[PDB]
Amino acid sequence: SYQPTPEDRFTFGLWTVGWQGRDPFGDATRPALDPVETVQRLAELGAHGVTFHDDDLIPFGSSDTERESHIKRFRQALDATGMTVPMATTNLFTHPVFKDGGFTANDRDVRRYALRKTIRNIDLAVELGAKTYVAWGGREGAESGAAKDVRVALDRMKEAFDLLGEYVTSQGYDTRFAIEPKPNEPRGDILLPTVGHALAFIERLERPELYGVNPEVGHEQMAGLNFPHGIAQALWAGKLFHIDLNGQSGIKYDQDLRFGAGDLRAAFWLVDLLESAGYEGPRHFDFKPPRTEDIDGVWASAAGCMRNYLILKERAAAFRADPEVQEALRASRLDELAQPTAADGVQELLADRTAFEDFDVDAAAARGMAFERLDQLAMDHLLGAR
Amino acid sequence: SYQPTPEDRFTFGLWTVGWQGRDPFGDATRPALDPVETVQRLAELGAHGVTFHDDDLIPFGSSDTERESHIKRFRQALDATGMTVPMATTNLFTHPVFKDGGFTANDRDVRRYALRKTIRNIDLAVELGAKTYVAWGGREGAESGAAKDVRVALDRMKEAFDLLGEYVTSQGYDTRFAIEPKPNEPRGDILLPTVGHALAFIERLERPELYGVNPEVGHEQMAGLNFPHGIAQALWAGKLFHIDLNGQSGIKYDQDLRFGAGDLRAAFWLVDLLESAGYEGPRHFDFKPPRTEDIDGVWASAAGCMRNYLILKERAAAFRADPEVQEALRASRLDELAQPTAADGVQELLADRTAFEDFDVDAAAARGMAFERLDQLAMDHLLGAR
Amino acid sequence: SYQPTPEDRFTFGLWTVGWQGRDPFGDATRPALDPVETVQRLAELGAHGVTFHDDDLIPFGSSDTERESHIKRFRQALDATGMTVPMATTNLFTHPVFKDGGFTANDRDVRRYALRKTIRNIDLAVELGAKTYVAWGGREGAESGAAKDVRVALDRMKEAFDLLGEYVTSQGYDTRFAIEPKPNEPRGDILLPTVGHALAFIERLERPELYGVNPEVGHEQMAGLNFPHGIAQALWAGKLFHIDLNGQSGIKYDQDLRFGAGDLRAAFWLVDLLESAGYEGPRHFDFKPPRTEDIDGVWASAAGCMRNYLILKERAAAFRADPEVQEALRASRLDELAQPTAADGVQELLADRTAFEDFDVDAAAARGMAFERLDQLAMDHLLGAR
Amino acid sequence: SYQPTPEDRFTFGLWTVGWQGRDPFGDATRPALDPVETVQRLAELGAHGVTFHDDDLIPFGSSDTERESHIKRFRQALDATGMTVPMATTNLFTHPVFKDGGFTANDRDVRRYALRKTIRNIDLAVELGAKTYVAWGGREGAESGAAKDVRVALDRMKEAFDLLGEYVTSQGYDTRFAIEPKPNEPRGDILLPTVGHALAFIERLERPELYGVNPEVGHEQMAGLNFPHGIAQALWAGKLFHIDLNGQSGIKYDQDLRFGAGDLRAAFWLVDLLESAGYEGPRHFDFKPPRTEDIDGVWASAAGCMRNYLILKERAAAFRADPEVQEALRASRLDELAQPTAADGVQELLADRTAFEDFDVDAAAARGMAFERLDQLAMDHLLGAR
């Protein structure tokens, strides 16, 4: 049933199937995976590519000899499978030197080091073929109010992203940045907590065009927000450069369940939106196989991610294609939302008696929107009871 | 103790002390207040001004005769007290014609009417002296996913705000707009749910400079976000045109408690920020006296709003002025966050061996940030145990 | 297909399809429904019965002849359709006199009135054949800490429930009580906020056997709790006397969406539990059709409530009947969970060297739980992908 | 000043100041603390005692001579300082074998091992003079619906607690059990998620009197519940055997901030309740110093825990002692809440015409509760503004 193909553009980070199971209250339940074995098993599952943090490929502290060998094995696995590397990122959160941040650490020397660690991995990403470079500022923030002046930390954050933009422009590299928002965890509150904050920030950068967002399903759901609405605003702004798919069941710690789990109706409305907007980037899964699972449970969770996307794609396409749904969208006046409010400008509007003086407000008030019927047709499609 | 003065710029909406107590499960517990009596009692309490929605001043459905009289009584109360009207807004949410929105209603004729109702009140606000005009799109959103295409609704929302901007520019009016974000209630999800989303949106308008945000304490706390951080990003972007103060105790329905209640530490860090950034606009309270109270409980809740602001102002000023706190900020390296990461550009950074090759990552990793000590000094100041 | 018949025990409150659309920020969008027309329209939809608050059937302040006339015409609608009244309840939250509670109001005279209003409706409910009497204390609680001494409020709440138990026992009525928990709204915090708190409270009443819980889907989800887990504990305790079914999309105000909407996977696991535990009570819908809808959208939403329960009933039955799922459950050792840990007793467990000193901890640690495979079979069944 | 002395019963877990800073996204930022140095540094801070998990004092897999040696040097640190051990607990969550639970693991052999690991530490705790034995089932739960049959898991959980009760009773040990509830983390949902669910469960055990609750501030706040209300119900039930004090800033991952931080007003109302109810147990701090801190920030955070409890103790005592507050409480009729509703009985209440037919409902509806004035007196006392 529903098999992944390379044209579905499913990708996974080395850190997702590679998660060993270490959590705040417990030790690892799985052995470390070799990146080479991960590229091979994912190519067998039907994935199109893999992503990585620098510390997933090259152990922190590796000499340039050991680094070369790691990179070399990895590149041989890719070349043998035809797997691509669409995106890459830096780990600016695991090592204790980043306990107060990377780009917005209060210590200047830590900020400089964070920038050098990042530029080094940007050079590697570009030769491996990555066209999107992701920044998740997991340690940028605070647990207490005087620990961080946020206006000055946004200057430092703007300064870091402007220097990265200056560096790829002078190298003539074809790579764009995507900021990944998260409202909290591991910091009490993280800077640029949602898609909207990250979008507003990009507009204050010296080269706005170089930067977009990499929203994640479970991160906007950790603030109780509607992830399809956030994604529609990122698409409206032209800034959906990448997306991270997974599941989350409410406002609690960051779960990273496989895609489809968590809020199932929101995953349906997200696939419907991505598919009807013709989003063309990777469908990247950033999930963690639960630590209850062994390695077979890992590849079953990874396969379940892609399967759930393909079943929802099919139900959504069937929803939109149904004549009765099309008729119900006309009835709920979704065609009329697409017509301009006042295409002849404000002076026509002002002159129009029917827009105010003679508007029958109670006739209009009494029209039913027919939204429940439309939503129960969407329910029957999702459940295949239509 | 702590008496409000006109220079504190405390303002209140007619709808706040005027709330009759009607809620989703219950009828009104208080009689309607006359606007004239509200201007007089608030001037006696030490408030500086009042704000209003059009339907708070002039009953929906009033003829231009009855409208004139309402406006006339109101203006006499203001002139007699010296009360100002700093801001005004439209009610695009109470009447059943707005059940699916005002500016983003699916029905085109409702959107045109919403625009005419708004322009009419913009003319009144400007003659009363309002310099900020607030838009709270309470009904813009949905309870179900196919009921609203969000990309098209943002076109309609951009179109409405661009027409309002064209109208005040051609009239030569000195009035700016402030968008008030709210994540949900009364709609399942409201469009532009947080400060960040509202900030990002403004940047796509034809005249960005005309528009800023009016954030509300309890609204960003309904998505579990840190309100002082959201306000610091609005100030960093130059867009804090106005602010609404109240309290909220967590992620639940919108409470509108008096300012100081709810998250007390966040109110302290907010006053500290507003006062040290030299914000100069109104300190507006948008709160609801609980329906358990009679009219004396109403003016006690309203007075408590201003009192709590003045006690926190004093504790914050004392925190920042203390030599021991200043020494603790140097120790947590808050002065170093203010220094540029790499003011000699990316090529100096790249050349610098000490930024990477020779950086002693474990010496840096081992420096303690001394944040708990700094936060316990902030705790002793707030509690006056210092 | 999925057509409801009275055999399915689907019931609806008069206040559900009869909600007019008045919310915290808006007026009514629909006309009041006559109880008589609600009884016949629901009988046609396939419903089994209706429930009521005293003030839904008899307008507050009715003279006893008007009271009698209302009951009389209701009773004849019931008799002509074969509709039943399984449950009734009291409105102790709408009138201004209940602004601080009914049974735990600080004013003693109000607490005596609340008990007399309730006893009058217990006599009426027993005459119409109600077997469960629900108590939703929506006004028992507080917005501030010193307003309510909670240990004393629980003494007053125990006092009220013991007096109602004494009353129905002296009348020899065959009726039982079900407490409906809600964490908040309309009070800042409500007493007995979840299923667990209501279950613990019942054990301290004089006649515990007379009382159980009426959990509501959306109420436990407002505290972010797992509603199928909460129902499993109420069933394990033998106290699930009734249930209210609806949808909620996260921690926010109380939405009362139609059942199936909100968290769809929790609706599936709930039906799987009710059906396999053999719950025999009413499947009651306490939902509110959105105020965007006219009277036709009202009956469409009500009909979708029943349709979604019947589609999920079928997918849950198919899931459990599948040999491959049955095999997946043995693989995840759900059969072993049913075996007693130590039926051999404590001294045999203590003498058992294989339970401790010779237990191979690393061999057990390495067994995967196979939970993700199992959950994807559940997902495939829910979506009809098998 | 606010100096802690052993008379204040302040206790700390070895795992609290001993947390190394390893979190879901990062490695340790601090070295392990020796138990012996923790006992003496806390005795100097004014603490009264320490608590431990078996694996905090004796590293997992210690041979019995290494076990004996660890206990021996711990016991001599204790004896030299006069420090006590009021409470102990078992670690049934860290080792990989507990990845599906201890007492409710699907594997039966793991459940027998979990009981043997616990009985071994009950013998040790009683030798060191512990009177309360805490059980925090952090791994009892699930991330998916079919993984755990919750009615059967509660049978296994009852079975485990009844076997521990049989064991301490046959040993004639004077020790009682306290269940610590948490809604989630590290499992998607944890069994017995709140105080109420643990209280209800206890009533179904064989010897209910042997068991109570150990509520934690931050755990109930992760479900958005009012922690002082939850403690008032545990005290009303006579089951508050122990308490864990810390801070949490909302519904998100579990922070374990120092007490006083997070929701400051709930910390004030909590201390007001513990002190006026006369709670006599340990004021235990289960918090984690942020990983931004070195060992000096660790002892500063621990010291702030005790300081904040003593400042709030003083403000709560001053609030209740104030004649003006005492007068405000009569005005809000908190004296009337203490009067029985109907000590005259049901037939006298039924015959009482002033309770219903002659009750003036509109006169009672009009009495304001004066709760906002009262809450602002509380606010003034908390901030030391009076």
Ligand SMILES: CO[C@H](C(=O)CO)[C@H](O)[C@H](O)CO
């Ligand atoms: C470990 O996953 C990270 C995340 O989402 C945090 O919740 C990011 O995906 C990573 O930094 C690269 O983007």
Ligand SMILES: CO[C@H](C(=O)CO)[C@H](O)[C@H](O)CO
């Ligand atoms: C009734 O208060 C409103 C609000 O905040 C909704 O939660 C706005 O303040 C009003 O529309 C003017 O801004």
Ligand SMILES: CO[C@H](C(=O)CO)[C@H](O)[C@H](O)CO
């Ligand atoms: C409006 O419905 C009520 C409720 O749940 C509100 O949250 C109860 O269902 C009713 O009082 C009887 O159960």
Ligand SMILES: CO[C@H](C(=O)CO)[C@H](O)[C@H](O)CO
């Ligand atoms: C790390 O501490 C534990 C906990 O609360 C985690 O949420 C318990 O306190 C401990 O197992 C004994 O009570």
Ligand SMILES: [Mg+2]
């Ligand atoms: Mg995540």
Ligand SMILES: [Mg+2]
């Ligand atoms: Mg991610």
Ligand SMILES: [Mg+2]
């Ligand atoms: Mg509000």
Ligand SMILES: [Mg+2]
């Ligand atoms: Mg507002």
Ligand SMILES: [Mg+2]
């Ligand atoms: Mg509800």
Ligand SMILES: [Mg+2]
């Ligand atoms: Mg209900």
Ligand SMILES: [Mg+2]
């Ligand atoms: Mg905790």
Ligand SMILES: [Mg+2]
């Ligand atoms: Mg604890």
